[PDB]
Enzyme design. Structure first.
Site, PDB file in Angstrom:
ATOM      1  N   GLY A 114       0.800  -1.214   0.000  1.00 14.62           N
ATOM      2  CA  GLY A 114       0.000   0.000   0.000  1.00 14.62           C
ATOM      3  C   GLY A 114       0.834   1.266   0.000  1.00 14.62           C
ATOM      4  N   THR A 115       1.895   1.294   0.804  1.00 17.42           N
ATOM      5  CA  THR A 115       2.734   2.485   0.876  1.00 17.42           C
ATOM      6  C   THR A 115       3.545   2.660  -0.403  1.00 17.42           C
ATOM      7  OG1 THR A 115       2.921   2.813   3.255  1.00 17.42           O
ATOM      8  CG2 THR A 115       4.854   3.305   1.936  1.00 17.42           C
TER       9      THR A 115
ATOM     10  N   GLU B 280      22.189  12.033 -19.283  1.00 20.60           N
ATOM     11  CA  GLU B 280      22.594  11.407 -20.535  1.00 20.60           C
ATOM     12  C   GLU B 280      21.674  10.248 -20.888  1.00 20.60           C
ATOM     13  OE1 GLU B 280      26.595  10.648 -21.382  1.00 20.60           O
ATOM     14  OE2 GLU B 280      27.390  12.467 -20.449  1.00 20.60           O
TER      15      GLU B 280
HETATM   16  N1  GTP Z   1      12.824  -7.309  -4.295  1.00 22.10           N
HETATM   17  C1  GTP Z   1      12.395  -7.096  -3.056  1.00 22.10           C
HETATM   18  N2  GTP Z   1      11.050  -6.952  -2.801  1.00 22.10           N
HETATM   19  C2  GTP Z   1      10.629  -6.723  -1.535  1.00 22.10           C
HETATM   20  C3  GTP Z   1      11.542  -6.644  -0.494  1.00 22.10           C
HETATM   21  N3  GTP Z   1      10.860  -6.412   0.646  1.00 22.10           N
HETATM   22  C4  GTP Z   1       9.543  -6.337   0.352  1.00 22.10           C
HETATM   23  N4  GTP Z   1       9.381  -6.542  -0.993  1.00 22.10           N
HETATM   24  C5  GTP Z   1       8.107  -6.518  -1.734  1.00 22.10           C
HETATM   25  O1  GTP Z   1       7.156  -5.749  -1.027  1.00 22.10           O
HETATM   26  C6  GTP Z   1       5.865  -6.273  -1.233  1.00 22.10           C
HETATM   27  C7  GTP Z   1       4.992  -6.013  -0.012  1.00 22.10           C
HETATM   28  O2  GTP Z   1       4.809  -4.625   0.159  1.00 22.10           O
HETATM   29  P1  GTP Z   1       5.809  -3.803   1.107  1.00 22.10           P
HETATM   30  O3  GTP Z   1       6.734  -2.934   0.297  1.00 22.10           O
HETATM   31  O4  GTP Z   1       6.594  -4.795   1.922  1.00 22.10           O
HETATM   32  O5  GTP Z   1       4.863  -2.958   2.094  1.00 22.10           O
HETATM   33  P2  GTP Z   1       4.431  -1.431   1.831  1.00 22.10           P
HETATM   34  O6  GTP Z   1       4.937  -0.898   0.515  1.00 22.10           O
HETATM   35  O7  GTP Z   1       4.910  -0.582   2.980  1.00 22.10           O
HETATM   36  O8  GTP Z   1       2.826  -1.469   1.833  1.00 22.10           O
HETATM   37  P3  GTP Z   1       2.025  -1.961   3.135  1.00 22.10           P
HETATM   38  O9  GTP Z   1       2.374  -3.396   3.442  1.00 22.10           O
HETATM   39  O10 GTP Z   1       0.544  -1.824   2.894  1.00 22.10           O
HETATM   40  O11 GTP Z   1       2.437  -1.096   4.297  1.00 22.10           O
HETATM   41  C8  GTP Z   1       6.054  -7.750  -1.518  1.00 22.10           C
HETATM   42  O12 GTP Z   1       5.287  -8.117  -2.635  1.00 22.10           O
HETATM   43  C9  GTP Z   1       7.515  -7.910  -1.866  1.00 22.10           C
HETATM   44  O13 GTP Z   1       7.623  -8.355  -3.192  1.00 22.10           O
HETATM   45  C10 GTP Z   1      12.895  -6.801  -0.754  1.00 22.10           C
HETATM   46  O14 GTP Z   1      13.726  -6.739   0.149  1.00 22.10           O
HETATM   47  N5  GTP Z   1      13.313  -7.034  -2.040  1.00 22.10           N
HETATM   48  N1  GDP Z   2      38.772  10.828 -29.962  1.00 23.63           N
HETATM   49  C1  GDP Z   2      38.154  10.892 -28.759  1.00 23.63           C
HETATM   50  N2  GDP Z   2      36.802  10.900 -28.731  1.00 23.63           N
HETATM   51  C2  GDP Z   2      36.140  10.962 -27.559  1.00 23.63           C
HETATM   52  C3  GDP Z   2      36.902  11.024 -26.311  1.00 23.63           C
HETATM   53  N3  GDP Z   2      36.006  11.078 -25.312  1.00 23.63           N
HETATM   54  C4  GDP Z   2      34.773  11.055 -25.874  1.00 23.63           C
HETATM   55  N4  GDP Z   2      34.860  10.980 -27.212  1.00 23.63           N
HETATM   56  C5  GDP Z   2      33.732  10.944 -28.162  1.00 23.63           C
HETATM   57  O1  GDP Z   2      32.788  11.949 -27.806  1.00 23.63           O
HETATM   58  C6  GDP Z   2      31.459  11.475 -27.982  1.00 23.63           C
HETATM   59  C7  GDP Z   2      30.688  11.791 -26.714  1.00 23.63           C
HETATM   60  O2  GDP Z   2      31.151  13.058 -26.265  1.00 23.63           O
HETATM   61  P1  GDP Z   2      30.316  13.905 -25.193  1.00 23.63           P
HETATM   62  O3  GDP Z   2      30.826  13.668 -23.796  1.00 23.63           O
HETATM   63  O4  GDP Z   2      28.849  13.579 -25.284  1.00 23.63           O
HETATM   64  O5  GDP Z   2      30.609  15.410 -25.662  1.00 23.63           O
HETATM   65  P2  GDP Z   2      29.795  16.624 -25.004  1.00 23.63           P
HETATM   66  O6  GDP Z   2      28.316  16.370 -25.131  1.00 23.63           O
HETATM   67  O7  GDP Z   2      30.157  17.902 -25.719  1.00 23.63           O
HETATM   68  O8  GDP Z   2      30.152  16.728 -23.544  1.00 23.63           O
HETATM   69  C8  GDP Z   2      31.552   9.983 -28.226  1.00 23.63           C
HETATM   70  O9  GDP Z   2      31.122   9.686 -29.554  1.00 23.63           O
HETATM   71  C9  GDP Z   2      33.007   9.618 -28.077  1.00 23.63           C
HETATM   72  O10 GDP Z   2      33.406   8.757 -29.143  1.00 23.63           O
HETATM   73  C10 GDP Z   2      38.374  11.011 -26.425  1.00 23.63           C
HETATM   74  O11 GDP Z   2      39.096  11.059 -25.407  1.00 23.63           O
HETATM   75  N5  GDP Z   2      38.909  10.946 -27.649  1.00 23.63           N
END
Ligand code: GTP
Ligand code: GDP
Ligand code: GTP
Ligand code: GDP
Ligand code: MG
Ligand code: MG
EC number: 3.6.5.-
Lengths: 49, 431, 116, 431, 431, 431
Positions: free
Chosen positions: D136-137, D246
Site C-alpha cells: 500500500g505504501t 545522458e
Molecule cells: N525485491 C524485493 N522486494 C521486496 C523486499 N521487501 C519487500 N518486498 C516486496 O514488497 C511487497 C509487499 O509490500 P511492502 O513494500 O513490503 O509494504 P508497503 O509498501 O509498505 O505497503 P504496506 O504493506 O501496505 O504497508 C512484496 O510483494 C515484496 O515483493 C525486498 O527486500 N526485495
Molecule cells: N577521440 C576521442 N573521442 C572521444 C573522447 N572522449 C569522448 N569521445 C567521443 O565523444 C562522444 C561523446 O562526447 P560527449 O561527452 O557527449 O561530448 P559533449 O556532449 O560535448 O560533452 C563519443 O562519440 C566519443 O566517441 C576522447 O578522449 N577521444
C-alpha cells in the site's frame, strides 16, 4: 625512458586502486571558482607542487 | 605577431585539448610548472603563437576550456599538465545537456555563452595580430556539438576576416555510443557549412584501426587516440612556429584547399606511424613517407577515397629533406593513379617543408586531402536521420525546448543539397 | 537495425573475424541520396497515420522455439550432383514444405547447388 | 557539483536502503559512526560541523517497525534521526488508504524534509525514488509523492527504481488492483523506470550464485550493485563519463514508453570465477542471454528500441566496439526499424567493491545494461488478464470504495493500460 | 633495377621458399639477424635483386608468404632463418581449403585476394625497374593450386609485359598423396597454359629417385628435397646477380626457349650430384659435368626425354671455365644423339657462363630443357581425370561451391587440345 | 587457429571422454588441477583468469550417475562445472524418448553452452561428436542435437565417432530399432563417420595385447589413440600436416556415402614388441589386414574407394612411398575403377605418448588409417535382417508410439536404408 610520441606511452593505472575523484571547481557565493587549492588528485594522492 | 587562440568544447574537446597542450609543450620544452627548460634557441623564437607571457618567466596557454558539466574539468585539472591553465579560462555551468543538442544550443547554452565570449574577447584584444581561432569538439554530443556550434556562429559575426578551424569528431557507422547521434549530427553540420573556414573530420573508429594494424598496440586506451589527433593539429601549424625551406601557414592552405566556399571538409592522416616491430625492418626515406601517406588504410576518417575523386591535396613535411625527392614523388602519385584526381585542376597537390622535425623523430609528414568521398558521410548520416525523424522518435525531448519542426526540415535539406552538389563535381567533364 | 559499411575497414567487422561463427545479418554496402526533406510519418506516441501503407509482418519479431520448430528439418547444405530425377524433387519439395521455418530469424537459409 | 537524493519508499524501499547505503559507506570509506578515519563523497553524503557526514536520503514508511530496526541497527548514529519518517498506521496492501486517507497526513511533513535536503545541495541532478508496485505504501503514498514532486520541480530528473509483480508468485491477493492504478503516475509523472521482479533474481541467484536458499538480503545486494554502477561515472573518473541526464534522453523514445529493463553481468560466485576467464566479450553476451534479465520476459520475442551500456573497471575501447559489433551481426537480436544506432556507452575506471558477507567474487570488470524493449508488452497482457477476471465480478472493490475514491477510476485505469498495450504494438509494426 | 618479387602460396609454397631464402642468404653472406657478414665485394653488389634495404645495414627479403592455414607459417617463423622475413608480408586467413581447388579459387580464396594484392602492389612499386615476379606452389593442393591460380590471373592483367615464372610441383603417378589430386591438377594447368610465361615441372618421386640412388642418402628428409629444388632456382638467376663471361637472365632464356606461346613447360636438373663414396673417384672437368648433366636419371621430373624430342635446351654453367670446352661438349651430344633433337631448328642448345661458383663448390651447371616427352605427363593426368569424371565422383564438393560443370569439360578439352598440339611438333617434317 | 570442440554424448561419450582427455593432459603437460608447471594446447584448452586451461568439451548424459563419477574423480577441478550437463531421468534404450520428449528438454541448454564455447574459439575447425547407436540418449538426443546443430552452423564440419552395434554380441535387445532410426535422420545432417564395434576391438586386445580379460577402459584407451592422431597435425608440426577439412573431402565421394572404417597399427605388447622390429612397411601392411580392423567386416568382401593415411613418429617420406607401391601391387587389395589414386597421406613428427598403466608399449613410429569401402554394405544387410523379423510382429513399438512418434516413421526409416544398400551397390559395379 622514452620520448613522447604516438605509441610511446604506458599507463601507470595497472593495479592502481581507489580511482576516486575530488571536487575541484564549484560555486561559492554564486561565483564560479576553484574552491580550495589544497585538494588532492585522482587516487587521493598529492598533486605536483 | 601570429597568435592562435585554442577554443575547446565538451568532454571530447577537453580530453583532446588536454593532450594537445602537453604535446606542443614538449615541442617548446615547457615543464609542468610552466617555465622554459628547453635548450635550443628556436624553441623560443615563436612561442607567442600559443603561449601568453606572465610574470616570473611563466608561459600560459591561450586556451578556453568550455563545458556545461564542471566535473570533466577536474580530470583535466588532475592530469600531469593540470596547473598550467589559468582558472579564469575554465568556464562551466551547473546542469549538463545529456547528449542533447537542443539543450546545449538553445536553453542552457544561452546562459553560458556570455561568459566565454568575455574570455576570448580578452584573449583576442591581448595579442596584436591574431591569425585565427581553433576549436576541438565532437558532433555526437550535447555541449561540443551544441554550445560549441553557437560559439562559432557568434565569432564569425564579430570577427569575419579571421580563420576558424575545427578538428571535429563525426559519428561512426558500425559502433555508435549515443542513440540520438544522427539527431545531433545533422543539426550541427548545417552550422558548419555556413560559418567555418576549415573542418577536419576525425572518426574514432578510423583511429581504432590504425592503433591496431599500423602501431599494433595490444591495449590502446583513449590517451593514444587523443595523441594521434594532437599529432595532426601540431602538423598543420608547425610552419607557423619553425622556419622552413618552403614556408606555409593556416591561411596558405585555406585559399588553396577550398575551390568553392561550400566545400571545406577534409580528411587528415599522419605518415610516420610504424609498429615497434616494424622499426627494425624499415628505411627512413621520403619515398616511403609518400607511400604510407596516400594509402587508404592510413586515413583517419571513415570513407575510402578510392570511391571518389581527390579534389585538392595538401601534404606538409617535417625534417630536413632534399626537395627533388619531395617533388618527384608528388608528380609520381598524381600521374600513376590518374583516375582518382579531378581533371579540370591539373596539379591538385600542395607541398610545404619545415626544417624542424617533431621531437625525437627524424622525418615526418602530415596529409590533408579534400575528396568527393566525404559525401557518403552525409549520405549515410542523412538516412540514419530520415529513418529516425519519420516516426517522430526522440522528438519530445527536442520539441520540448520549443523549437519548431522546420529546423530539422531545413537541416536535412541543407545536408542533401550538399551531397548533390558534391556529387556533381565528381561527375564533371574536363572539356 | 541496418548495418552499414566501414568501406575500407569492412574486413574488421566481417562476422567470422568477430568470432561470430553463425549465420549473420547482411551488410548494406551502397546507399543513395534523398533530395529535399522528409514528411512526418507518425503522430505522437509513434503510431502510423491512417493514409500510409504498412507491412503485414508480425509486430513481435519472428523467433521459433524447440517445440514450435518443425520435427523434420532438411539440411542447409543441399547438393544435386548424382541424385536421380525424383530423389532431387522430393528433397527440394521437402525444404519448401514449411514456409515458416525458412522465414524465421532463427530459421535456416538453405543453399542449393547442382542439377540431377 | 553533482548531488542526488534517494527517496526510498516502503518496506521494500527501506530494506533496499540498508543494502545500498551500506555499499556507499564501503565505497567511500565512511565508518559506521560517520567520519573518514579526498572530497569524493559529496553526491551522496554531506558534512556537518562535527566532521560527521549525513546521508542524502529520506526513509519513509506508513508503519513504524521496519524503520524502527534501522533506528537501532549498526548504523543508528550514521543516519540523522529526523530523516527516518514513519507513521502510526499504514495502508495495509491498499492503494486508496495509502493515497487518500493516510498518505495526506504525512505528505506535508516529508515535502518539507525534501526541501531541507534540496537547499543543502547546489546542483541537484535528480531524485532516485524506490518503491514497490505491491504494498500500500509503495503503491499509494509513492504515487502521491510523484504528483506533488512534479509541481515543485518541473525539470528535475525523477528516476524510479521499482519491484514489479512476479509472473507466478506474489505475496498478495489484491495486488493486481494495486499495480493497475499506480501506473497512471509512473506514466505521466516519471522520467524513467527500472521494473524488476524478484522471481527473476530468485532464478538468477540459485542458477548462478549457487545459493539454493536465498533471502531478501541476498536480493537487496544485487539491486545495490545496479544503482552503484549507475552513479559510478558521476562519482569516479572515466574515459566516457555518463551522467543521469545522458541516459534519460537516450532510453525513452516516446513519453508513454519509458519502461526499460535492467541487466547485470557477471553475477557469479567465487568457485565459478576460479575456472572462468572474464573478458569484455564474455560478459556482454551475458547481457543478451534471455536467462539473465531481471524481468521474466524474452527479448527474442520482441525488438529492442534503445539499449544503454554501463561498463566499469579494467575495460578498453578495444573490446567494447568489437563486442558491440559482434552483437549487431546476429540474426537472433531484433531492433526496431527506426533505430539503426541504438547504443549508449559509458566507461568508468573504479572497479566494483566487494562487501564482506556477500555472495559475489571480486572481479576486475563488470557491466550494467538498460534495454527498452517491446517484449515487456507481454507482461501487461497477463497483468490486464488477472485484473480483468477479478474486476469482472467486483471482488475487493468495497475496500477501495469505502476509503473514499470513486469506482470510475477503476474502469478508467484499465483503459489507459488497454491503450498502452496497443502502443507497444504499433512500434512493432514497420512500414 | 632488375628485381624479383618472390610469391609463395600454400604449404608446399612455404617450405620450398623457406629453404630457398636460406639458400641465397649464405651466397650473399647474410646472418640470421639480417646483416651482411660476407667478405668479397661481389657478395654485396647486386643484392637489390632479391633483398630490400633497411636502416642499420639490414636486408629484408622481397617475399610474399601466402597461406590459408596459419599452421605452415608458424613453422617457418620458428626456423633459424625465420625472423628475417618482414612481419607485414605474412598474409593468412582463418580456415583452409581442404585440398579443394574450387574452395580455394572462388569461395574463401577471394576474401584473401584483396590483401595479397596490396602487399604485391607495395613491393612492385618500390623497385624502380621490375624484371618480373616468381611463384612456387603445388598443383595437388588447395591454396597453392587454388588461390595461387587466382593471383596469376590477376597480376597478369595489371603487369602484362613482366615475366611470370612458376616453380610448380606436378603430381606423381606411382604414389599419390591426395585422392582428389587429378581434379586440382587439371583445373590449374588450364590456368597455367593461358597465364604463364615459363613453367617448371618439379616432381617429388623424381627427387626421391635421386636421393636414394644418386646421393645415396639413407634418410632424405623434405629439407633435402627442398635443397635440390632451390639449387635450381639459384642457377636460373645467378647470371643476373654475378658478372660473367657471357651473361643471361630470365628473359634471355624465356625468349630463346619457347618457340610458341602455348608451350612453356621444362624439366630442371642439377649437374654436380655425387654420392659420398663416389667423391673419392672423380676429377672436376667440363665433360664430367655434361655427362651427368644430360643423364635421364638426373632429371627432377617423371618423364624420360628418350621417349620424345628435345625442342630447345638450356644450360647455364656456373664457374670459371673455358669457352672452347663448354662449346665443344654441347656440340658432341647434338651430333651423337641425333634423333632426340628436332630437325627444323639447328643448334637447339642455349648456353651461358657465370664466373662465380656456388659457395663451397668449384663448378656446377643447370639444365632447362623443353621437349615433347612432357605430354607423357598431361596424357597421364587426363586418364586419371576421365576415370574419376565419368562417374561424376568427388563432384558434390566442387559443384557445391557454385561452380558449373562446363569448366571441367573445357579444361580437359584445353588440356587435350594441348597434347594433340604438342604431338604434331614431335612428328614434324623439316622440308 | 586450429581448434576443435568435443560434444561427447551418453555413457559411451562420457567414458570415452575420460580416457581421451586423460591423454590430452599428459600429452601437453597440464596438471590435473589445471596448471602447467607454447600455445599448442589452444586446440583443446583455453586460457583463463587464474592461469588455467579448461577444456573445450561438453559432456552430456541424461542419467546423473555416469557424470557424477567425473565430478568426484581425479579431474574434478580441470573441467568447468557448467560443461558437465546431466538430467534426472534417462532415455532408457529408446530412440523416441531420447528424440521427441526427453531429449528436447535439454536441447536449449546444451545449445547455449556450445554457443559460449564456440564464441571463445578464434577459428574453429569443426565439431567432434562421440556417441552410440545403441543407447537412447546416445542416439535419440544426438540425432536431435545434430539436426539442430546444422541450422545453427551450416558449413562447419560435424564429425561423428560412433559405436555401431555388433553382429553377434549385444548389450541390448531393442538396438536394431534404435540404430535404424538414427541413420535416416543423420544421413543428410552429417559429414563423416568412424564406426567401431566393440568385439572387433575386443579380439585385437586379446590377440595382440595379451589381455585375455579386457574391460571397457582398454578399449577406450585405443579409441583415444585414434582421436589423438586425427588432431595430431593440428597440435604439433609435421612434414605434411592435415586438417579436419582436408580428410573429409578426400574420403566422401558421393553425398550419401560417409562411412569410413578406422584402423590403428601397431598394437603390440611390451614383451611382444621386444622380438619384433617395427618399420614403416611392417605396420602399413598391418593396416590392411582383415584380422585387425575394428569393424567386423573383411574388405576382401568389397572394394576400397578411398583410403586416408595418418603417419606419426620416426617416419621417412621415402619409406611411406615404398610401402604404398607394394600395397597397390597385390590383387587381394582391390580398388574401384573410378579412383585410380586412392590415398591421402599425412606425416607428423611427435611419436605417440603412452599413459602409465595402459596397454601399448611406447613405440618410435605409428600409423592410423581411415578406409572408406563398400564392404560395410554387408553390415547394413544384417542390420535390416535384425530390423525385419522384429518389425513384422510389431514388437516393442508400443513403447515408441507411446512416447510420441508415429509408426509411419518406422517404415520410412527402413525404406531409406533399403535405398542406401542399393546406393552401396551401384558404386561397387565396374563399368
Ligand atoms: N525485491 C524485493 N522486494 C521486496 C523486499 N521487501 C519487500 N518486498 C516486496 O514488497 C511487497 C509487499 O509490500 P511492502 O513494500 O513490503 O509494504 P508497503 O509498501 O509498505 O505497503 P504496506 O504493506 O501496505 O504497508 C512484496 O510483494 C515484496 O515483493 C525486498 O527486500 N526485495
Ligand atoms: N577521440 C576521442 N573521442 C572521444 C573522447 N572522449 C569522448 N569521445 C567521443 O565523444 C562522444 C561523446 O562526447 P560527449 O561527452 O557527449 O561530448 P559533449 O556532449 O560535448 O560533452 C563519443 O562519440 C566519443 O566517441 C576522447 O578522449 N577521444
Ligand atoms: N566402446 C564403448 N561403448 C560403450 C561404452 N559405454 C557404453 N557403451 C555402449 O553404449 C551402449 C548403451 O548406451 P549407453 O551409452 O550406455 O547409454 P546412453 O547413451 O546414455 O543411452 P541410455 O542408456 O538410453 O540412457 C552399450 O550397448 C555399449 O555398447 C564405452 O565406454 N565404450
Ligand atoms: N617437394 C616438396 N613437396 C612438398 C613440400 N611440402 C609440401 N609438398 C607437397 O605439397 C602437396 C600438398 O600441398 P598443400 O598443403 O595441399 O598445399 P596448399 O593446400 O596450397 O596449402 C603435397 O603433395 C606435398 O607433396 C616440400 O617441402 N617439398
Ligand atoms: Mg508495507
Ligand atoms: Mg544410458
Amino acid at each position: 625512458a622514452l620520448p613522447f610520441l604516438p605509441g610511446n606511452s604506458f599507463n601507470r593505472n595497472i593495479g592502481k586502486e581507489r580511482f576516486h575523484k575530488s571536487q575541484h571547481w564549484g560555486f561559492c557565493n554564486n561565483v564560479r571558482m576553484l574552491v580550495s587549492e589544497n585538494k588532492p588528485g585522482v587516487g587521493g594522492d598529492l598533486l605536483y607542487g | 605577431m601570429r597568435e592562435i587562440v585554442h577554443l575547446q568544447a565538451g568532454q571530447c574537446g577537453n580530453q583532446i585539448g588536454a593532450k594537445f597542450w602537453e604535446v606542443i609543450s614538449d615541442e617548446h620544452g615547457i615543464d609542468p610548472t610552466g617555465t622554459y627548460h628547453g635548450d635550443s634557441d628556436l624553441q623560443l623564437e615563436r612561442i607567442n603563437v600559443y603561449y601568453n607571457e606572465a610574470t616570473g618567466g611563466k608561459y600560459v596557454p591561450r586556451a578556453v576550456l568550455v563545458d556545461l558539466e564542471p566535473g570533466t574539468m577536474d580530470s583535466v585539472r588532475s592530469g600531469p599538465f593540470g596547473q598550467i591553465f589559468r582558472p579564469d579560462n575554465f568556464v562551466f555551468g551547473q546542469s549538463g545537456a545529456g547528449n542533447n543538442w537542443a539543450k546545449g544550443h538553445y536553453t542552457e547554452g544561452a546562459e553560458l555563452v556570455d561568459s566565454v565570449l568575455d574570455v576570448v574577447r580578452k584573449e583576442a584584444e591581448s595579442c596584436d595580430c591574431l591569425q585565427g581561432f581553433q576549436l576541438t569538439h565532437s558532433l555526437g554530443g550535447g555541449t561540443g556539438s551544441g554550445m560549441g556550434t553557437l560559439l562559432i556562429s557568434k565569432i564569425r559575426e564579430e570577427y569575419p576576416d579571421r580563420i576558424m578551424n575545427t578538428f571535429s569528431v563525426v559519428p561512426s557507422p558500425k559502433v555508435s555510443d549515443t542513440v540520438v547521434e544522427p539527431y545531433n549530427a545533422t543539426l550541427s553540420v548545417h552550422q558548419l557549412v555556413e560559418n567555418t573556414d576549415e573542418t577536419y573530420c576525425i572518426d574514432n573508429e578510423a583511429l581504432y584501426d590504425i592503433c591496431f594494424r599500423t602501431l599494433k598496440l595490444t591495449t590502446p586506451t583513449y590517451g593514444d587516440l587523443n595523441h594521434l589527433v594532437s599529432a595532426t593539429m601540431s602538423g598543420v601549424t608547425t610552419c607557423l612556429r619553425f622556419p622552413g625551406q618552403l614556408n606555409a601557414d593556416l591561411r596558405k592552405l585555406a585559399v588553396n584547399m577550398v575551390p568553392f566556399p561550400r566545400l571545406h571538409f577534409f580528411m587528415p592522416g599522419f605518415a610516420p606511424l610504424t609498429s615497434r616491430g616494424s622499426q627494425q625492418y624499415r628505411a627512413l626515406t621520403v619515398p616511403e613517407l609518400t607511400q604510407q601517406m596516400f594509402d587508404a588504410k592510413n586515413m583517419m576518417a571513415a570513407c575510402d577515397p578510392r570511391h571518389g575523386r581527390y579534389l585538392t591535396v595538401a601534404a606538409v613535411f617535417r625534417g630536413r629533406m632534399s626537395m627533388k625527392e619531395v617533388d618527384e614523388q608528388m608528380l609520381n602519385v598524381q600521374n600513376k593513379n590518374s583516375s582518382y584526381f579531378v581533371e579540370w585542376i591539373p596539379n591538385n597537390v600542395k607541398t610545404a617543408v619545415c626544417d624542424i622535425p617533431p621531437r625525437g623523430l627524424k622525418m615526418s609528414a602530415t596529409f590533408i586531402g579534400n575528396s568527393t568521398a566525404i559525401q557518403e558521410l552525409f549520405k549515410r548520416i542523412s538516412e540514419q536521420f530520415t529513418a529516425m525523424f519519420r516516426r517522430k522518435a526522440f522528438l519530445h525531448w527536442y520539441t520540448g525546448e520549443g523549437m519548431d519542426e522546420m529546423e530539422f526540415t531545413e537541416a536535412e535539406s541543407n545536408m542533401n543539397d550538399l551531397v548533390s552538389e558534391y556529387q556533381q563535381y565528381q561527375d564533371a567533364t574536363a572539356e | 537495425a541496418t548495418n552499414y559499411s566501414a568501406n575500407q575497414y569492412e574486413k574488421a567487422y566481417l562476422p567470422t573475424y568477430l568470432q561470430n561463427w553463425s549465420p549473420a545479418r547482411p551488410t548494406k554496402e551502397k546507399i543513395a541520396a534523398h533530395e529535399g526533406y522528409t514528411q512526418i510519418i507518425a503522430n505522437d506516441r509513434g503510431h502510423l497515420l491512417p493514409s500510409v501503407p504498412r507491412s503485414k509482418a508480425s509486430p513481435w519479431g519472428s523467433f521459433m522455439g524447440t517445440w514450435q520448430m518443425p520435427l523434420k528439418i532438411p539440411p542447409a547444405k543441399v547438393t544435386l550432383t548424382a541424385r536421380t530425377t525424383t530423389a532431387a524433387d522430393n528433397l527440394t519439395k521437402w525444404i519448401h514444405k514449411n514456409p515458416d521455418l525458412l522465414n524465421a530469424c532463427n530459421g535456416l537459409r538453405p543453399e542449393i547447388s547442382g542439377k540431377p | 557539483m553533482r548531488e542526488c537524493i534517494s527517496i526510498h519508499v516502503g518496506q521494500a524501499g527501506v530494506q533496499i536502503g540498508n543494502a545500498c547505503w551500506e555499499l556507499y559507506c564501503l565505497e567511500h570509506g565512511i565508518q559506521p559512526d560517520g567520519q573518514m578515519p579526498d572530497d569524493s563523497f559529496n553526491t551522496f553524503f554531506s558534512e556537518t560541523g562535527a566532521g560527521k557526514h549525513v546521508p542524502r536520503a529520506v526513509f519513509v514508511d506508513l508503519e513504524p517497525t521496519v524503520v524502527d530496526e534501522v533506528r537501532t541497527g549498526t548504523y543508528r548514529q550514521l543516519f540523522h534521526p529526523e530523516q527516518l519518517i514513519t507513521g502510526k498506521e499504514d495502508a495495509a496492501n491498499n492503494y486508496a488508504r495509502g493515497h487518500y486517507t493516510i498518505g495526506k497526513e504525512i505528505v506535508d511533513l516529508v515535502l518539507d524534509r525534501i526541501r531541507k535536503l534540496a537547499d543543502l545541495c547546489t546542483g541537484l541532478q535528480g531524485f532516485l525514488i524506490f518503491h514497490s508496485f505491491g504494498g500500500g505504501t509503495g503503491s499509494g503514498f509513492a504515487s502521491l509523492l510523484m504528483e506533488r514532486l512534479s509541481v515543485d520541480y518541473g525539470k528535475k530528473s525523477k528516476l524510479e527504481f521499482a519491484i514489479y509483480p512476479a509472473p507466478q508468485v506474489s505475496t498478495a491477493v489484491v495486488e493486481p488492483y494495486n499495480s493497475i492504478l499506480t501506473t497512471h503516475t509512473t506514466l505521466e509523472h516519471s522520467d524513467c523506470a527500472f521494473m524488476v521482479d524478484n522471481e527473476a533474481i530468485y532464478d538468477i541467484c540459485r542458477r548462478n550464485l549457487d545459493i539454493e536458499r536465498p533471502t531478501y538480503t541476498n536480493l537487496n545486494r544485487l539491486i545495490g550493485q545496479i544503482v552503484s554502477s549507475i552513479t559510478a561515472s558521476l562519482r569516479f573518473d572515466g574515459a566516457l563519463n555518463v551522467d543521469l541526464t545522458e541516459f534519460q534522453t537516450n532510453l525513452v523514445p516516446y513519453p508513454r514508453i519509458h519502461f526499460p529493463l535492467a541487466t547485470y553481468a557477471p553475477v557469479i560466485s567465487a568457485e565459478k570465477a576460479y575456472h572462468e576467464q572474464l573478458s569484455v566479450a564474455e560478459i556482454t553476451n551475458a547481457c543478451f542471454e534471455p536467462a539473465n534479465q531481471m524481468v521474466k520476459c524474452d527479448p527474442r520475442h520482441g525488438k529492442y528500441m534503445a539499449c544503454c551500456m554501463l561498463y566499469r573497471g579494467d575495460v578498453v575501447p578495444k573490446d567494447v566496439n568489437a563486442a558491440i559489433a559482434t552483437i549487431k551481426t546476429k540474426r537472433t537480436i531484433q531492433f526496431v526499424d527506426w533505430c539503426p544506432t541504438g547504443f549508449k556507452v559509458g566507461i568508468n575506471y573504479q572497479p566494483p567493491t566487494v562487501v564482506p558477507g556477500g555472495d559475489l567474487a571480486k572481479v576486475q570488470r563488470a557491466v550494467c545494461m538498460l534495454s527498452n524493449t517491446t517484449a515487456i508488452a507481454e507482461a501487461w497482457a497477463r497483468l490486464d488478464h488477472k485484473f480483468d477476471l477479478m474486476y469482472a465480478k467486483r471482488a475487493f472493490v468495497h475496500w477501495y470504495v469505502g476509503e473514499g475514491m470513486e469506482e470510475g477510476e477503476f474502469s478508467e485505469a484499465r483503459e489507459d493500460l488497454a491503450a498502452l498495450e496497443k502502443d507497444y504494438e504499433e512500434v512493432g509494426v514497420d512500414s
